[PDB]
């Protein structure tokens, strides 16, 4: 009955440093939608945890030798018991680690500065002018690296080519959409949040696919099922919809 | 340490009635790639099983009230412990049941009678003449019912419309490709097998996506993990590639 190791990274509004005048330490340093989720699971399931930020600051992708990085690596290597973060359940990652049932559903879409009236990814694929891209070693990059659709094959061709098109993280990518003629391939529910705070930014097109965020565990983890079940209970009483509204509630445009 | 209930259905060359002069009963009635897989898992993991054919003869899809049928229903309702069959791991079904790690990877493609030189699904979507379709209440139908791609949205529009375009099973669909101007949306590894036996049939286009076949269990099943691990062991020694060659080895064209 020890404290579980939780791996995570910084992403508004899922995991953040809470603001204080004193210097925070431990779990107390963190807040956000996933912190509220983790707290709720800990309570329902009766466990405690120590939260640790993944050292490379990545979600996780396979390299060209088949090696993982990011939080995925952390679970593979059993350095963490859970990955609590906006981690995308992909069948590609399901060969290295396990997921709980999804706690949020989102799609890939396009974040872009209002102005040039593009309306779809076809518009981007067919031109070099507006540069686009994704977060390096994330699920949105991999989705493009793996796709058989000739549009997304065409788009990945472009990100593959350009050195500056694959950004280190979400924050840096949002910055590029604000300071360059640049379109960031991003996840839907984050686009929602971003475009509520940043009124010169908008979503382009609708969803480019459908997927879910899950809690990551090593393969054959004994908490996988307990967590899945609690997440489903929370979901059926629409608590997760309420938790989402709490952290997405913002100004307006 | 009781015998597990296995749910299954008839599909060449995964599950079949073996040929005998006497009347078979029990597990002895069955043979095929999945039978060989089930046998191997039983041996590695030390369990026994009673195989039962799902009464409605379906893999499983949600109706318009959210209700499941087929083998998916069988696991939900705990009538079976495992689904051993060419069952497609879809995130849609992962809300009702669990999957093991995949034992085979396949994509959707098009099975069609050689003649009219179509080369892609775009060709089908854009015309009414050659009728196409899929197996009713299967993963390939659902994939079309759920898709956001305007081509597959267009194709699903057509299957949705036509009463005869959604076939009862694989067998009946293959029959329609042979006796009508008709293209069956099917899974890759089955197309391989079919087109080796039936030389007026061919595959049109490449893969339309990527996915896997897994062993289905109810949610939070205690064999899910044991089975996943054994399947991975089998896979790393490339036994599953050998098992596949055993059942796909056929004449030629
Ligand atoms: C919310 N969030 O996480 C972001 O927008 C950051 C980048 C995401 C990460 C993704 N969820 C993964 O699991 O790789 C992306 O690759 O699009
Ligand atoms: C091998 N096989 O099973 C077939 O071709 C028959 C129909 C498949 C079933 C699919 N694997 C499912 O899990 O729904 C399809 O929906 O395309
Ligand atoms: Cl830390
Ligand atoms: Cl039976
Ligand atoms: K501080
Ligand atoms: K504890
Ligand atoms: K017989
Ligand atoms: K037994």
Curated annotation (Swiss-Prot), chains A, B:
Stated name of the protein: Glutamate receptor ionotropic, kainate 3
Question: Does the keyword Chaperone feature in the UniProt annotation?
Answer: no
Q: What does this protein do?
A: Ionotropic glutamate receptor that functions as a cation-permeable ligand-gated ion channel, gated by L-glutamate and the glutamatergic agonist kainic acid. Binding of the excitatory neurotransmitter L-glutamate induces a conformation change, leading to the opening of the cation channel, and thereby converts the chemical signal to an electrical impulse. The receptor then desensitizes rapidly and enters a transient inactive state, characterized by the presence of bound agonist.
Subunit-structure text: Homotetramer, and heterotetramer with GRIK4 or GRIK5. Can form functional heteromeric receptors with GRIK2. Interacts with PRKCABP. Interacts with NETO2.
Molecular function per GO? adenylate cyclase inhibiting G protein-coupled glutamate receptor activity; glutamate receptor activity; glutamate-gated calcium ion channel activity; glutamate-gated receptor activity; kainate selective glutamate receptor activity; ligand-gated monoatomic ion channel activity involved in regulation of presynaptic membrane potential; transmitter-gated monoatomic ion channel activity involved in regulation of postsynaptic membrane potential
Where on this chain does L-glutamate bind? 86, 88, 93, 139-140, 187
* Parent-record interval covered: 433 to 805 of 919
Source organism phylogeny? Eukaryota, Metazoa, Chordata, Craniata, Vertebrata
The residues that the database entry marks as glycosylated are: 1, 200
Going by the entry's taxonomy, the superkingdom of the source organism is recorded as: Eukaryota
* Gene that encodes it: Grik3
Keywords from the UniProt entry: Cell membrane, Disulfide bond, Glycoprotein, Ion channel, Ion transport, Isopeptide bond, Ligand-gated ion channel, Membrane, Phosphoprotein, Postsynaptic cell membrane, Receptor, Signal, Synapse, Transmembrane, Transmembrane helix, Transport, Ubl conjugation
Query: What processing steps or modifications follow its translation?
Result: Mass spectrometry data suggest the protein is N-glycosylated at five distinct sites.
């Amino acid at each position: 009955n020890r404290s579980l190791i939780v791996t995570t990274l910084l992403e508004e509004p899922f995991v953040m440093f809470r603001k204080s005048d004193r210097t925070l330490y431990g779990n107390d340093r963190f807040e956000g939608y996933c912190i509220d989720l983790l707290k709720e699971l800990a309570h329902i399931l009766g466990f405690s945890y120590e939260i640790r930020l993944v050292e490379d600051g990545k979600y996780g992708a396979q390299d060209d030798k088949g090696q993982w990085n990011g939080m995925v690596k952390e679970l593979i290597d059993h350095k963490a018991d859970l990955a609590v973060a906006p981690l995308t359940i992909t069948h590609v990652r399901e060969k290295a680690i396990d997921f709980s049932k999804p706690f949020m559903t989102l799609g890939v879409s396009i974040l872009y500065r209002k102005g040039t009236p593009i309306d779809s990814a076809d518009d981007l694929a067919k031109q070099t002018k507006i540069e686009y891209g994704a977060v390096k070693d994330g699920a949105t990059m991999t989705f493009f690296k793996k796709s058989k659709i000739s549009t997304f094959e065409k788009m990945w061709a472009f990100m593959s080519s350009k050195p500056s098109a694959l950004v280190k993280n979400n924050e840096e990518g949002i910055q590029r959409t604000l300071t360059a003629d640049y379109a960031l391939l991003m996840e839907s529910t984050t686009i929602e949040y971003i475009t509520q705070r940043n009124c010169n930014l908008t979503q382009i097109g609708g969803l480019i696919d459908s997927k879910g965020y899950g809690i990551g565990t090593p393969m054959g983890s004994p908490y996988r099922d307990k967590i899945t079940i609690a997440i489903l209970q929370l979901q059926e009483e629409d608590k997760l919809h309420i938790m989402k509204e709490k952290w997405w509630r913002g100004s307006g445009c």
